[PDB]
Amino acid sequence: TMDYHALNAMLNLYDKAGHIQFDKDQQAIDAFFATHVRPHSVTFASQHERLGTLVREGYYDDAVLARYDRAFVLRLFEHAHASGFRFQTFLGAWKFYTSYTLKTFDGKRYLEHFEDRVTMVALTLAQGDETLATQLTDEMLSGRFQPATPTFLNCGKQQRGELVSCFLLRIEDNMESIGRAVNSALQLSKRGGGVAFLLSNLREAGAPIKRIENQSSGVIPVMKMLEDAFSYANQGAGAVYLHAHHPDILRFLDTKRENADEKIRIKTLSLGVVIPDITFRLAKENAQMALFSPYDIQRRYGKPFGDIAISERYDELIADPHVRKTYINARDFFQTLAEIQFESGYPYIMFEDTVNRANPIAGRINMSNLCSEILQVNSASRYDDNLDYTHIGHDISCNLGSLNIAHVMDSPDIGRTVETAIRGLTAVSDMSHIRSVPSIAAGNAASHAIGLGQMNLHGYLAREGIAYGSPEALDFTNLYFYTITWHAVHTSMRLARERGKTFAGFAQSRYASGDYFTQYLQDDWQPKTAKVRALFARSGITLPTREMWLKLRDDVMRYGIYNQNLQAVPPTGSISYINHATSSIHPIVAKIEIRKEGKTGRVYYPAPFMTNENLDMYQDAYDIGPEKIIDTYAEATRHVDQGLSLTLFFPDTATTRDINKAQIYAWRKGIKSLYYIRLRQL
């Protein structure tokens, strides 16, 4: 019966009673291992000899093993293979062997299995610490923690790409900066990519140059340039963010219209827009939108457009005659916005006042990343004519990992679970040295920002018989994130003691003063529901209490924190299939997801814990709709210091107004940002 594809395909059939036949997927795993994995895996007389061979023939990096006693290494591997790990789905297994595990240089045999890859990851992150390493191994094999693909994929390998592949850069209003950006785009893209540029500081189309009254091609030409950079370095991708109140806003959005011109046509780059609070109020009362000149604003306040608070100074700015102001219709802005999103899925939205109002770090937040999940502060750089740095500013980069909620709730020692992931991601940052872009490097060194995310929320809720979006769900979500947060700040606090240093700028932060905690010292803490009350109960998990916050608040005000930023909820792409989770805290996109991969062209993927006796608990995001989704992310947004990738799923019948209403709701509810607008499918 050894066709694994056909077996998998069986997941795509319903019996006269609309039931699936889930066992067939297991059979497909089995036949996969028997007909393909085993027959093409390389097995050694022993671990010792294996590590020997792999180092010798150039596959594994001895440098990583050299930080441990060989005996320890051999033990850890064995412990790993004895955990009794199993892939839960054909896709997970297939995805791991086809694109994660290590193969021979000629691509014909496999040199690694799950526990192996895991082990090496653990060894790399723990960098000498045996306990840590062991903990990493356990966390990963239990399915509890699951680092982002760029980490899980390269750790320990000799031929590896970077561990960090997510960057946010500023551009300053001058050729030096622009030239650097293009260069940074080349350098980064050329290995992993995932780069976003802020364009808000650039002078508008028409602004003067060198005293000559009307010369400025605007941001478009700058975009075209990035677009080509990215294209040339083939892999990586780019995004640009522009403030809503920027004079080029409309032509900026027009680039993503099928029907416009050739040099107002950016096909690859992703767009993102920053929208402050007022522009909402203006549209409410059908007023005009004032677009301010970044050129004038600079000369008149000594700060770039992107470093000032538009909303706060909206009036002050309008009254100032020195600032040229052009106008457009607020409502029309949101109109074209929805129209573009409607066709391309973009832009992204970054709710500038909501974000800065929550931002505990000194400074402002003016952009976001390619997945609209990262939110940190940055600072300008200054260059010499020869392009040498004169002052190295701070740009942003971050590594990610997330832990499977379900599995977390299936283990009493949550504190350990969180401390370990945080330690591991922290190690990722510590080991990062992106020298090709000094600001990126400098930035990482001064902040140690990491992003610990969550996934499998829907999968969890389903299992425990809770409907997505319901009041119980909303209550879990809130308390669960309430918790994770505690253990993280705690962990980061501890780290600060051990390393005897905090993140740069800690002193000016909110953590230092204690304001960060006011929220957790007031009540709305305990369970709105009873079921939820019992879930944490049955779990052994202990919801942090006033005393515990009060305590942490003192340990934090005194010892500090290591990481400037801890949490962040990006979309879990393929790592989620190997971990067998529903992609983040958003409902499943389908009961049986279909991917276009392999000889068959199709590969099917059933959701976690889903059986023919609870299908009614697995409703797709389209069915659940945006309201319930938004509502969920909101409970989380209260705690996650960074941000979460939020995609709305709309029917194909939906209208721009529908979209627009979802967005307003989002704004109204506290959402820090929005990702795509996925209209219906093929």
Place this chain on the structure above:
Amino acid sequence: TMDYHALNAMLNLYDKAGHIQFDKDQQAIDAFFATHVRPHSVTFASQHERLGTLVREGYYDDAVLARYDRAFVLRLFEHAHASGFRFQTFLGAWKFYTSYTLKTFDGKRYLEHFEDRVTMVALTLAQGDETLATQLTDEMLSGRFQPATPTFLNCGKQQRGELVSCFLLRIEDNMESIGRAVNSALQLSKRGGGVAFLLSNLREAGAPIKRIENQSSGVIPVMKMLEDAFSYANQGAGAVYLHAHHPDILRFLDTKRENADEKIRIKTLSLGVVIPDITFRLAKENAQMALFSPYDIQRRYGKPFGDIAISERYDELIADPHVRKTYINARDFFQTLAEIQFESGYPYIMFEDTVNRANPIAGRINMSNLCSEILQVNSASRYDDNLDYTHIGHDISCNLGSLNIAHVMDSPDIGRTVETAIRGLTAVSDMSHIRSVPSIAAGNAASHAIGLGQMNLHGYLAREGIAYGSPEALDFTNLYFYTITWHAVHTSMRLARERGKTFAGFAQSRYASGDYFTQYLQDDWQPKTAKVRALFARSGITLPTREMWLKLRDDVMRYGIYNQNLQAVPPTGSISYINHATSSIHPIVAKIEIRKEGKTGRVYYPAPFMTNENLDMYQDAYDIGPEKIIDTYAEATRHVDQGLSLTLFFPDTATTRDINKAQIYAWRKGIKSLYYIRLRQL
């Protein structure tokens, strides 16, 4: 009668006897000065007060005057205005006031007249030396010398652009270099522009990267990137050169085809192609053309494609199995070549063996400039990951100026005439510090290359009743350049004594060994003709003699030379109209040239010394044809150490074969390069 345009227009009418009515142009000058120049020029109570005012209100740069005793400055100005300078044509006057002379900041009055601008130029170049300054003034006012527009236009002004605006850069086969190039393109273009890049070292489309077998998008994506750079920084322009034997040659030429695709479509960038001797031989015997991989060549010889001698190692390379070789048809190469030129005017051709065979400087010449007149050696640069220079190579830049042949022959002291121009251009280089591109700066500092050119050759020949292309013309051309050359090497030799230093690398040069002079120590020196013999006679000019060369050869082998390169014959654009010369040593493009400028849309320009009694001596380049033109440039190419911009003018009936035959002839005759293919007009 005070319409100057209408008067000018009169030059566009023929009487029943096909005669023009040249006096009307003079009338147009007169009415111009009376109705426009005078009424809008600003005149001061005295020079002293003027220099005072202009420095105070921000127009003139006191820094330049501060290197002289004010009294000297006042004198020089007066001497200037007393020379009795006159514009010879309405266009010259109109061109000077509309786009060279200094105006008030609001653009409504004139602050300068010819002698004024000249003076400031002299003051700037002479940098303290009164004699020099005075000489500069005389040379310029007599119409003898005429510096390139970027110099004549900015010297002395407070708001000025750079004096040097002509650059040639290398690109190395790696992202750092590519990133820098884009940046250099931005930086340079953003002020004057005129930049050319060598692409020959870049790996071909398909070559490996990082061991991965088929990844290299080739040169096109790199071109698109430059193209966008140039576009963004609005002004400046770019060129790319590619070796004929480079694997991407065909797709490189295909970019300039109307009918090809969208991402194989470079509209702005100019193309140039380097073609060695063999590819000619191969096409002769209808063989195949071997295209070698620059990727392989590097790994196997430690030198980039562009630093090796293809022709010399053509066989050796074909036999080497390590060098991947693709093939195309030689004859087909030249076919598509002519076809492209046919439609766009390009490419340019750089006859690589001819050039290196003449090149007296140690090293090879692999590219050229935007006007195909510059030919020097360059050397690679090496960068650190952060884009910082690790080793600063030597790129190329050059400033130009040329002297009106006629006026030169109308003055006995040619030696002074040449020494002065050389001194002045040398000062241009000495004062150049293009810090935004270290290699450019380093290069200029090590070579002090300048380019002294010629113009008004046709105008001269006509006046003296010699037909362009005739044996007498060919004889003058040769002897005249024979002469200029002497006085230049002499001048540069002298400079080396005064400054007590020579150009870097002098020792490895040909000047040091003495081989440069072998040519001038053998005969074909004296006049083939008798008329020519008398021209130099009537002039007082003394054709250098064996003893004079023998002497210079000893002074040179001992004291050295200051400039690595001296001569170069670019096209004289607008400066030629103000100087009233025929554009370089090529026949006139018309008897009454028409330019599309001003309120009238048209402005007419009669050639020098042309009257209704010698029209038959002024035949256009179309009439003269390419053979005679080529023949002329050949006589000059024997002496000019750098190169000359050679454009062929073909009838609209011409065919690619016609073109191709002109090119072969050119190659055969010693031409170092070719510029456009101007097919007939509108």
